[PDB]
Design an enzyme around this catalytic site. Structure first.
Site, PDB file in Angstrom:
ATOM      1  CE  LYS A  19       1.411  -0.216  -4.901  1.00  0.00           C
ATOM      2  NZ  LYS A  19       1.117  -1.695  -4.761  1.00  0.00           N
ATOM      3  CG  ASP A  20      -0.592  -1.281 -12.862  1.00  0.00           C
ATOM      4  OD1 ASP A  20      -1.267  -2.231 -12.361  1.00  0.00           O
ATOM      5  OD2 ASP A  20      -0.313  -1.204 -14.091  1.00  0.00           O
ATOM      6  CB  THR A  21       1.975  -3.683  -7.423  1.00  0.00           C
ATOM      7  OG1 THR A  21       1.992  -2.534  -6.576  1.00  0.00           O
ATOM      8  CG2 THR A  21       3.173  -4.553  -7.056  1.00  0.00           C
ATOM      9  CB  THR A  58       1.468  -5.212   0.198  1.00  0.00           C
ATOM     10  OG1 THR A  58       0.417  -5.104  -0.756  1.00  0.00           O
ATOM     11  CG2 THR A  58       2.012  -6.664   0.240  1.00  0.00           C
ATOM     12  CB  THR A  59       5.042  -2.383   2.409  1.00  0.00           C
ATOM     13  OG1 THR A  59       5.239  -2.679   1.027  1.00  0.00           O
ATOM     14  CG2 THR A  59       6.442  -2.254   3.083  1.00  0.00           C
ATOM     15  CG  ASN A  70      -4.355  -3.543 -10.848  1.00  0.00           C
ATOM     16  OD1 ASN A  70      -5.415  -4.159 -10.678  1.00  0.00           O
ATOM     17  ND2 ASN A  70      -3.484  -3.847 -11.812  1.00  0.00           N
ATOM     18  CE1 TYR A  71       1.884  -7.513  -5.915  1.00  0.00           C
ATOM     19  CE2 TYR A  71       1.440  -6.560  -3.737  1.00  0.00           C
ATOM     20  CZ  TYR A  71       2.261  -7.274  -4.596  1.00  0.00           C
ATOM     21  OH  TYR A  71       3.475  -7.718  -4.132  1.00  0.00           O
TER      22      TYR A  71
END
Lengths: 293, 292, 293, 292
Positions: free
Chosen positions: C154-156, C42-43, C130-131
């Site tokens: 990675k859980d956002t 995303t970033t 996961n986002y």
């Protein structure tokens, strides 16, 4: 379709129900063409009332009209049962309850059991009042059908698909909207009407929107609907439940006392500011011949 | 950090508070290392209790312990003020309120005025009980700062960022979590502990998780935490508030009577199926020497 | 635990990846103690990149370090497959994908099929990113276990209960948080670390928060965490993804070009305003000896 | 009011747009009374299409009809601008975009700039396609007013209050709903109609609901609406976007190939079970003389 007022409960300075102001307000509403009065709803601060106060409200309004839906629900099922049973001596339209509130993640079985209990003891038709934002639960068309004993439902939700679904799954149920901004739309789409909080202060406008829509004057109905929408928006500035008292005094010309804290009354300055927000709408409604000059 | 029990209110078949059973429960909790008892919380069906009943509860628990936070809130501010004032005669930790519930879209000014009014009349420290899913509104770290008078907050929300924000904006406030699944985490991250509904039925587990986390034995803390999580999940099958009665009877061995309808009691078949679900967990806990 | 940077993609004035600015940024991050670089997240505006651009980014960063998680996902599964397969010639940590985005109400079967397809073809360990806010779907601990092929997640999400559940149901999975405000907490509670967007501009702060927490200096870790939280809040004023470019230039001292529109660059005045919001934090971090004077 | 079809993009087994099948579909839709076709929408998997593929779609449909709203949006503004400009050579109704999707917490100023940029370069009227659940952001009546340049809006949201607000704040804007379950209601309440995904497979039903509502035959309109609702519900069992292919084949009698993975095609067993679910509905529709 019908316009039903969830009638305001006026309180005195010493936090008791002002029975005489309530009767003035109820008589005015019936005179202005309101179909039925829903007593002890959200707008009447019903969850803030004791069972005895809920009964006092029924008795006061009944001195004026028998066209009453009597809300009896709460978090003590014995109290709700006692109120439902007491209603046997009154010629009213029905009793009502919201879903049990506060507690999240209630089982569907327990919610169904709650409503079936009230239907079991009711001497009158029973109305479901669905308000997922206020109660935290949804009693949708499917669950309403499962319960199987409702005469009607008021759905307070902006999702009109959910409201239509009651009619789809329960074709003989009366189905009302709790959305004031949808009076025109509800009328036009074959639903049974609205329980309109804004009919406390503008019963004239709410009944006229419905009438215009049913006369097939949709553009005219929407123009008036959009004016009513502006008043609702103004009521939300200081808190709608509190603002409702000021708006009724302003448009209808009689005092409605105070709300019950934590629903705090508007102070003098807030009242002045709110009136400045709606006075141009009042002028327009006088010009349309909806309100008397 | 601390473990605080939002103590269950036992009722009779005829819907009265069973004061005898409540005292047995309170005595056991304190005996098993629970730091304080929060009376008239969600778990004790506080919103289902009249003002006199909330006072009745305080009185029964006060016979056992003064380590009490007394919840007084409701939709009649005069009643809440009266309870706050009557607490003067009780040597307790503090009073508390949830935000006014049910009514959506309450103004921030009105919410602030409600809590400041309680602070103005309170003879004890005042705790915010923040529970957005239950009440429909969030009294977040910024609103709490504006109110300015809270001694502590219990935050029942999934979002531990939201809970940590109370400490960030209000550094001298006591900050507790209401999420039982976060006992290990909350204790490890520098917050003040948990008001743990599952500590009604497994006070041994919750106190041990806290201790292990304090010792920085995080792996051991998490193993225990994950077992507590499984019992919480089991309690959700038939409804947690109702299931809490049955689980306390099962694990602690005394009866807690009935909840108050529409919080309906589990039937015999439901109880049997719930016990089946947590039987294995009890066996593991006895093996770990946490239970007898 | 580890700090992983979802590395920014610098663009030129003519909307192409600036490969040389990217290499400067990657070398600085590795030098400041960042464990791994997550590329096309995303970033890094990964959903705005073509497959060829996603490959160009891998190649540019790989010239600096092989400690890379390579994000390859998108709405064309053939493209995602082609990228996963191409990665066979690179000594990297793993490939990654977010859930298919945009489309609501995707069946669990189809979501599982998507991820299993990528695992089928991957020459490397596979990471779930996961986002739910960005993609509209949640691939929770249960679904992750069902898929069964993930090395890490990675859980956002601010819900750390959901993040812990991955560890509970998948004890041997690496579990990271996407929440920058939770670096201290994640470290302290036995999780594997954070994919921290704010480590682009303050790698020094992010690695120090983790270090303090693991040294059992929780109060000191939280004080620094709360300063980092203020920078994140400032980044949200003008839009964090755009603000990230300005913050990196400011704190790290090299230019990162532009984002890709609709992620519009801050103008000169917005840049001036943002710097005024964080310059006192910079002074504090110099005083704590975290940043060089 | 109008019925506008967000036309399905048929794909080959090897993931290319099947232009032949697309033209068969477009011709049938127009033939059956559909007012306009919205190309590269959610239902046509527009977010899964490259810019050239979006242009490919416009070209195939344009061979059949000029009654087209051409969706051009994406996460590369230069590509969207290029598509807007190339539309100059097509005598169409307008262009359209969703809000930039995926990225949460985009500033209002940036969202406004995105849409104003498209308006500045467009050789045609511009339509807002508002879909908060899909894009993660809401371009509501107030934001649309601020942007100031839209000819029309399609609003895919449950909340018809939100849809009516576009008319209230922007009285000369065309305002459509994206909720197929509201065709009857939208037509009766003075809005401009629906972009109806279910009109891919049951264009006869959606056009008839509209007609009946226009005649003020609301009871008859609702009976038909409620049947369309049941087919929509059936399409959700295995995933609507995938199921739309199978339902179009079943009701309209030509094949529409495959969707684009991860929008996976239904398997044989799924197709069989879906057909079972809507078989009865088809029978009722033939009885009502809506289908042959």
């Amino acid at each position: 379709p019908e316009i039903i007022t969830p009638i305001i409960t006026p309180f005195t300075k010493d936090n008791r129900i002002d029975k005489e102001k309530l009767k003035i307000h109820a008589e005015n509403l019936i005179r202005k063409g309101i179909d039925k009065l829903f007593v002890n709803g959200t707008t009447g601060l019903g969850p803030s009332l004791s069972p005895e106060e809920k009964l006092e409200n029924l008795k006061a309004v009944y001195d004026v009209t028998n066209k009453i839906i009597f809300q009896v629900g709460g978090l003590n099922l014995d109290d709700a049962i006692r109120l439902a049973k007491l209603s046997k001596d009154f010629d009213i339209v029905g009793i009502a309850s919201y879903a049990p509130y506060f507690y999240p993640r209630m089982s569907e079985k327990h919610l169904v059991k709650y409503f079936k209990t009230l239907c079991e003891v009711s001497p009158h038709p029973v109305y479901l009042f669905n308000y997922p934002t206020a109660t935290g639960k949804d009693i949708d068309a499917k669950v309403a059908k499962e319960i199987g004993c409702f005469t009607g439902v008021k759905d307070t939700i902006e999702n009109i698909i959910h409201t239509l679904d009651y009619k789809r799954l329960n074709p003989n149920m009366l189905v009302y909207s709790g959305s004031d901004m949808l009076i025109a739309t509800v009328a036009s789409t074959g639903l049974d009407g609205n329980v309109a909080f804004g009919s406390n202060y503008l019963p004239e406008v709410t009944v006229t929107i419905k009438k215009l829509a049913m006369e097939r004057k949709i553009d005219e109905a929407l123009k008036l609907q959009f004016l009513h929408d502006e008043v609702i928006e103004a009521s939300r500035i200081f808190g709608s439940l509190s603002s409702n008292y000021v708006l009724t005094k302003y448009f209808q010309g009689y005092d409605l006392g105070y709300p019950r804290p934590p629903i705090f009354p508007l102070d003098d300055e807030e009242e002045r500011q709110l009136i400045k927000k709606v006075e141009g709408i009042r002028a327009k409604l006088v010009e349309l011949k909806i309100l008397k000059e």
